[PDB]
């Protein structure tokens, strides 16, 4: 009895944060539900890069004053993450934005020799999303819903 939704979510989010911080594309195999996970990561690559670029100044301003220096500070970021959803609203935009800010922070962690904090950051983000938004996620068919939400068709409809 292991948490398969957490595992899948963590794989997607951990890989994205790590690849954003380093520019390296992990050659490790995805594994169970690898198909959905691959498409989710690819989607996150397209849309997340846009969020970070579109809102670079906002993200920089936040990062600057949050003064993240080690794992203790990462732990503290969970508080902000909780409050993003404290109004009762969940949607994919907020989820991508949170993950995208995570990637932005991961980049920063890399620069200050705190790469060891990237995995705890990914775990924290995944924890909040999966543990506290599980019912909403399931109602979208999980990461399949994520892929579909951001899907842009090329149909001469």
């Amino acid at each position: 009895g292991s948490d398969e939704l957490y595992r899948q979510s963590l794989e997607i989010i951990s890989r994205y944060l790590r690849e954003q911080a380093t520019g390296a594309k992990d050659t490790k195999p995805m594994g169970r539900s690898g198909a959905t996970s691959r498409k989710a990561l690819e989607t996150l690559r397209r849309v997340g890069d846009g969020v970070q670029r579109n809102h670079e100044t906002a993200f920089q301003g936040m990062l600057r004053k949050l003064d993240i220096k080690n794992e203790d500070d990462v732990k503290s970021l969970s508080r902000v993450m909780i409050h993003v959803f404290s109004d009762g609203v969940t949607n994919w935009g907020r989820i991508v934005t949170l993950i995208s800010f995570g990637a932005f922070v991961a980049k920063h962690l890399k620069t200050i020799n705190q790469e060891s904090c990237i995995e705890p950051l990914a775990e924290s983000i995944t924890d909040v999303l999966v543990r506290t938004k599980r019912d909403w996620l399931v109602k979208q068919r999980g990461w399949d819903g994520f892929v579909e939400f951001f899907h842009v068709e090329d149909l001469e409809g």
């Binding site: 969020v51 809102h55 906002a58 936040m62 949050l66 508080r79 902000v80 993450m81 909780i82 409050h83 993003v84 404290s86 109004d87 609203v89 949607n91 994919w92 935009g93 907020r94 989820i95 991508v96 934005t97 949170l98 800010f101 939400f149 951001f150």
Partner: peptide, 24 residues
């Protein structure tokens, strides 16, 4: 209120604005 709420608000705003690009 507490600073964390201000930061969350910024992310919520960005997220909701982004959601509206795709929601349909």
């Amino acid at each position: 209120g507490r600073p964390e709420i201000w930061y969350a608000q910024e992310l919520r705003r960005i997220g909701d604005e982004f959601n509206a690009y795709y929601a349909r």
